[PDB]
Design a protein around this nucleic acid. Structure first.
Lengths: 67, 511, 611, 51
RNA sequence: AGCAAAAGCAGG
């Protein structure tokens, strides 16, 4: 377990265990679990910013050529 | 910044006529052609010249297979005679550490007689393998009944297993000066091995291995939708293909091999100093029920420290068997067959009650062969690639471009069978199966003999197509091809059978 | 009943079903043992090929070097690397006469590239031979090694950043008598070339023993191969630098150009095959002569800095390898014997074939490493050899064969495909015997065993089999179709990009490529455990997937590594995944994804803990 | 464990009934300890028969 | 004993 590595900053945002109790991160930075990711994507800050298509909007242009 | 010494080396590198770089450069820069080539040609010996000949219809003699002892099997797991103790369709949420699924399946079967050997090995020590199998059964019952459920079990060191893997067989590195005094030393017994003769057993194994088993043996998931044309054509081709392939016994060998090699590589990279038990376990979905973990056979992995990937790892393999030996004792000079009593098979009338024997052979594979046996899904894919290449060729010669023209029609268009005074024809189904199983055996009996044969049969068959279509082919030296083929036919049965197939092809084609 | 796939191969056309003779769907055989025996046999073979040629010892080396050129004409059809430089020069002269201005233009391209080039490019290689540890090692460590040793040397080109000054100062300190290694030992150590048995040689029984060069010669071969790439790009008969479907078309185009039979009162055959002993019977002397002729009327320094490669080809002392591992039978004890002492040991411990090989080579051993230069180094991507051999095909312009018959075609590094014409079988036999003779007079040996000849329409070349109009190809086998093993964000991307590259370049049909993507996503999920949300399979993770999967608003618009479906197919592979999903996702998920608050930066991306 | 593994639908624990005596949060954290202990033993230990 | 080959493993 614990394939993923990441900083200590994540420790504040999310718990050490989920509802079932299986762990997201543990110390010997902190090792983080892949479950930790799928916990972010269920509950996390929602923000309607469109800055990240700064350059990712390029690929949409290539898809408009297809469809 | 030549420094002159390079001009020294250069002036020494040139042909004998010119002794300096500068005279060479001046000659070249001041060079012109004066028709020297014709003087060179007329000057030359006429002996040095490549003379064509008519590669005539009756010229190519039947390639003579080598003669010697009978060919013997070397597969890491037997192929036709094996059987599988089912699990009877467990639930869908219950994962299983594989030992317990195996144990559950071994627990399912009753019919265990006392072990007594049925085949004399003629080498080694048969009783020791008997007692190895005994250790296996005892260890399994003892761990599971009265311990804290260990996920993975490694056997106990004994005379039996330690003999059958030879942890003492190693010699030790030493310096040269201390042993140069000895005269017993030799570089190595680096020489050709014993010849072998073709026999019928491998042909039977192949025939059984092309045949349809009953189950489905492989699932396949969904992918993004299909809008463009080429998407639809790809979809229909792959659907036809996988539906035809899935009911193979080749695909059974495929998933079996993949799981076996993955398990062994996991173990060896994760565990070296310990004799491990592993099953030959494979996951198959019943056509009409739930997922089924079949137990083909136990394994006793031998210790494995791989300083290089090329290195061999040795082990012992136990795969159950119904069919008796001594019907084909040539097929194995290597097995060590035990008796394990009866299994009460149910036929349409009565009950068969045939005995049960076990083939506790030993072996050793590799790291590399384990990797390439893990990647046999590529081999399935490669069979698809070949069929698709055939169909794209037929689409280039005819603009119909019709996959459906061949994939499903009831039309005898493909010969793969030779019968007494006959040739059989089959449909694309049998042929996709056969091409697959050929590639699988290529993946199992891969050996430089095969690659040599492949190149040489390729060139000669190409010449023979050139001949049969009246394309006036020629070959300068032919007995070179024949002797090199005979060089590459050393001992491998699969090679040998491809060669007998080549032979009967020459005969029935008549070129 | 018996069974056979050979009879489907009976009826079916051979070239279309040729892949059935492509059994490489399993691990290649490899060489468990030290290649040194195969090396000795190759050296024995090439020195036997040039035994008529005289040799004279090189200065400061102690080593016999054989110069086959200006040797006699061969006696027998058995191959032999005997050639005459005049043939080479008149060949290149006819070439430049045929292709005017091509030489000077490629030369100017070489000038501008050497002026613009930089040392930073060469270090991205694989297994250049280092001289310190006396073993093949990576290229970055190699560059660090040479620049530090040069910092120790009196030269200062590693600080320059340019490259030709670097090669020049390599040469200058290479002429030094000490570094802690004397001049003779150092020149033997710089010219040394590891033996390093071939691995993955598909389609043989014994092994070729590919030997590889070091970094110091690598830049010289880089420059000359850049020239070769330019001149072959401006050529129409090369096969190596031309590639993909353009190469596929070039094959068909040359056969078009020569198969058109105006006044077809003459029969026509079109050879294919494989020129045996390519890396042996050739020679660097012919290469140096070619080089001198190619850069006519140019800056003299360029002439020199591009002639330096064939000369050090012209004298090279490759190693032999590890050695052997003798063993006691009775006492059962073994040891490795480094072959550096092989020029001292008795001739009794060994095997008899091995013994005779040793006595053949034991004279030819200086510092233990074998010396030879009648023959090319095994397995280099030279392609100036193609520039050579294609000139032969150019001689068969009817202006210059100056007879009724005439040849033409194309020729990559080892394969070759002539196309001839003559009024009868007798005339074609005459002209092809003339060609074979000519091709030997340049020191190129067309084998008579594994080659053949036929009417036009069908001919092999470089495995791009060309039946009448069909151009099936089996150049390289499909590789792996498995994850790259980095992260759930880019592994998928890497796999799709690899699939796209191998369908666009090679002949991965889409019918197999959808199935490849299918196996790939299966492996992706089974590795990262992350099957579909709407499933029934269990694992560690599946809790959160079955949680988020109902948590969503748009269900199919999800990335695959978290429960999502794979909308890829052969239409839309170059694009990434989240571009295809983005506006099919709701702002909660999208906001959670692209956010700098993630430690992940792309939130699926990350670094795994080392092990 | 297999049956508890079957069910999904676990929200965060917050008490719904005031005990009016004792300490409700402590029983909440007891239940938390239970779930955590069960997942932790079964995922990453040598399968103890009784915990 | 075995693997597999014109040489190596069978632990360092």
């Amino acid at each position: 377990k614990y394939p993923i590595t990441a900083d200590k900053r994540i420790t504040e945002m999310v718990p050490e265990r989920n509802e079932q109790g299986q762990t997201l991160w543990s110390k010997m930075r902190v090792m983080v679990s892949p479950l930790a990711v799928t916990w972010w994507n269920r509950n996390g800050p929602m923000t309607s910013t469109v800055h990240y298509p700064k350059v990712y909007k390029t690929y949409f242009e290539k898809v408009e050529r297809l469809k | 910044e030549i420094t002159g010494t390079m001009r020294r080396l250069a002036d020494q590198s040139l042909p004998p006529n010119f002794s300096c770089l500068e005279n060479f450069r001046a000659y070249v820069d001041g060079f012109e052609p004066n028709g020297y080539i014709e003087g060179k040609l007329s000057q030359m010996s006429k002996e040095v010249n490549a003379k064509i000949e008519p590669f005539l219809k009756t010229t190519p003699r039947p390639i003579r297979l080598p003669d010697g002892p009978p060919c013997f099997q070397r597969s890491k797991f037997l192929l036709m005679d094996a059987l599988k103790l089912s699990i009877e369709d467990p639930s869908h949420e219950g994962e299983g550490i594989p030992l317990y699924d195996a144990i559950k399946c071994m627990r399912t079967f009753f019919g265990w007689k006392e072990p007594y050997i049925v085949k004399p090995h003629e080498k080694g020590i048969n009783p020791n393998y008997l007692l190895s199998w005994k250790q296996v059964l005892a260890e399994l019952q003892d761990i599971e009944n009265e311990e804290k459920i260990p996920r993975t079990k490694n056997m106990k060191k004994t005379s039996q297993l330690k003999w059958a893997l030879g942890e003492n067989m190693a010699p030790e590195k030493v310096d040269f000066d201390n042993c140069r005094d000895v005269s017993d030393l030799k570089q190595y017994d680096s020489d050709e091995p014993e010849l072998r003769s073709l026999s019928s057993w491998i042909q039977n194994e192949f025939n059984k291995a092309c045949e349809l088993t009953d189950s489905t043996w492989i699932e396949l998931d969904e992918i993004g939708e299909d809008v463009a044309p080429i998407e639809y054509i790809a979809s229909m081709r792959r659907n036809y293909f996988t539906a035809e392939v899935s009911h193979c016994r080749a695909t059974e060998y495929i998933m079996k091999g993949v799981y076996i090699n993955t398990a062994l590589l996991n173990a060896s990279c994760a565990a070296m100093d310990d004799f491990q038990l592993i099953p030959m376990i494979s996951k198959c979905r019943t056509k009409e029920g739930r997922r089924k973990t079949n137990l083909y056979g136990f394994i006793i992995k031998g210790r494995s420290h791989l300083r290089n990937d090329t290195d061999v790892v040795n082990f012992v393999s136990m795969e159950f068997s119904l069919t008796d030996p001594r019907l084909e004792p040539h097929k194995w000079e290597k097995y060590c067959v035990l008796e394990i009593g009866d299994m009460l098979l149910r036929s349409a009338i009565g009950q068969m009650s045939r005995p049960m024997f076990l083939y506790v052979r030993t072996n050793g594979t590799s790291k590399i062969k384990m990797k390439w046996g893990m990647e046999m899904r590529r081999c399935l894919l490669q069979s698809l690639q070949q069929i698709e290449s055939m169909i794209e060729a037929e689409s280039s010669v005819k603009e119909k471009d019709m996959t459906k023209e061949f994939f499903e029609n009831k039309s005898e268009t493909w010969p793969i069978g030779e019968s007494p005074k006959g040739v059989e024809d089959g449909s694309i189904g049998k042929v996709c199966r056969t091409l697959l199983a050929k590639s699988v055996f290529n993946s199992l009996y891969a050996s430089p003999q095969l690659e040599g044969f492949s190149a040489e049969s390729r060139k000669l068959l190409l010449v023979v197509q050139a001949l049969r279509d009246n394309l006036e082919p020629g070959t300068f030296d032919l007995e070179g091809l024949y002797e090199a083929i005979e060089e590459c036919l050393i001992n491998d049965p699969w090679v040998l059978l491809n060669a007998s197939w080549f032979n009967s092809f020459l005969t029935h084609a008549l070129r | 009943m018996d069974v056979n796939p050979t009879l489907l191969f009976l009826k079916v056309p051979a070239q279309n079903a040729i892949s059935t003779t492509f059994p490489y769907t399993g691990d290649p055989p490899y060489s468990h043992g030290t290649g040194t025996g195969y090396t000795m046999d190759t050296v024995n073979r090439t020195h036997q090929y040039s035994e008529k040629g005289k040799w004279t010892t090189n200065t400061e080396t102690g080593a016999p070097q054989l110069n086959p050129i200006d040797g006699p004409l061969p006696e027998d059809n058995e191959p032999s690397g005997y050639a005459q430089t005049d043939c080479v020069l008149e060949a290149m002269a006819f070439l430049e006469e045929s292709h005017p201005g091509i030489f000077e233009n490629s030369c100017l391209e070489t000038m501008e590239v050497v002026q613009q080039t930089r040392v930073d490019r060469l270090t991205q290689g694989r297994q250049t031979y280092d001289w310190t540890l006396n073993r093949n090692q990576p290229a970055a460590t190699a560059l660090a090694n040479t620049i530090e040793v040069f910092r120790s040397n009196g030269l200062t080109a590693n600080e320059s950043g340019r490259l030709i000054d670097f090669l020049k100062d390599v040469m200058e300190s290479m002429d030094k008598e000490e570094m802690r290694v004397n001049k003779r030992s150092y020149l033997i150590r710089a010219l040394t070339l590891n033996t390093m048995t071939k691995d993955a040689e598909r389609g043989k029984l014994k092994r070729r023993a590919i030997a590889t060069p070091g970094m110091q010669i690598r830049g010289f071969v880089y420059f000359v191969e850049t020239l070769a790439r330019s001149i072959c790009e401006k050529l129409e008969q090369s096969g190596l630098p031309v590639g993909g479907n353009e190469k596929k078309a070039k094959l068909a185009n040359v056969v078009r150009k020569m198969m058109t039979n105006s006044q077809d009162t003459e029969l026509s055959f079109t050879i294919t095959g494989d020129n045996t002993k390519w890396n042996e019977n050739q020679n660097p002397r012919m290469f140096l002569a070619m080089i001198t002729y190619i850069t006519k009327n140019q800056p003299e320094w360029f002439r020199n800095v591009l002639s330096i490669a064939p000369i050090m080809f012209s004298n090279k002392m490759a190693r032999l390898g590890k050695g052997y591992m003798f063993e006691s039978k009775s006492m059962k004890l073994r040891t490795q014997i480094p072959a550096e002492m092989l020029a001292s040991i008795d001739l009794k411990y060994f095997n008899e074939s091995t013994r005779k090989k040793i006595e053949k080579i034991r004279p030819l051993l200086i510092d233990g490493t074998a010396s030879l230069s009648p023959g090319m180094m095994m397995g280099m991507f030279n392609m100036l050899s193609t520039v050579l051999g294609v000139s032969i095909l150019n001689l068969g312009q009817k202006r210059y064969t100056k007879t009724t018959y005439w040849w033409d075609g194309l020729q990559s590094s080892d394969d070759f495909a002539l196309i001839v014409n003559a009024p009868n079988h007798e005339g074609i036999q005459a002209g092809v015997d003339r060609f074979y003779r000519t091709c030997k007079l340049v020191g190129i040996n067309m084998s008579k065993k594994k080659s053949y000849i036929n009417r036009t329409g069908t001919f092999e070349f470089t495995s791009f089999f060309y039946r009448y109009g069909f151009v099936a190809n089996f150049s390289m086998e499909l590789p792996s179709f498995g994850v790259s093993g980095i992260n759930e964000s880019a592994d998928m991307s890497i796999g799709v990009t690899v699939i796209k590259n191998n369908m666009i370049n090679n002949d991965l049909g889409p019918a197999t490529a959808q199935m490849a993507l299918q196996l790939f996503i299966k492996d992706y999920r089974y590795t990262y455990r992350c099957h579909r949300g709407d499933t029934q399979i269990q694992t560690r993770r599946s809790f959160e997937l079955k949680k988020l999967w109902e948590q969503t608003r748009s269900k199919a618009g999800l990335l695959v590594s978290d429960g999502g479906p794979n909308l890829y197919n052969i239409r839309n592979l170059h694009i990434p995944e989240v571009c295809l999903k983005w506006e099919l996702m709701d702002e909660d998920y999208q906001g959670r994804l692209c956010n700098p608050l993630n430690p992940f930066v792309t939130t699926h991306s990350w670094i795994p803990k080392r092990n």
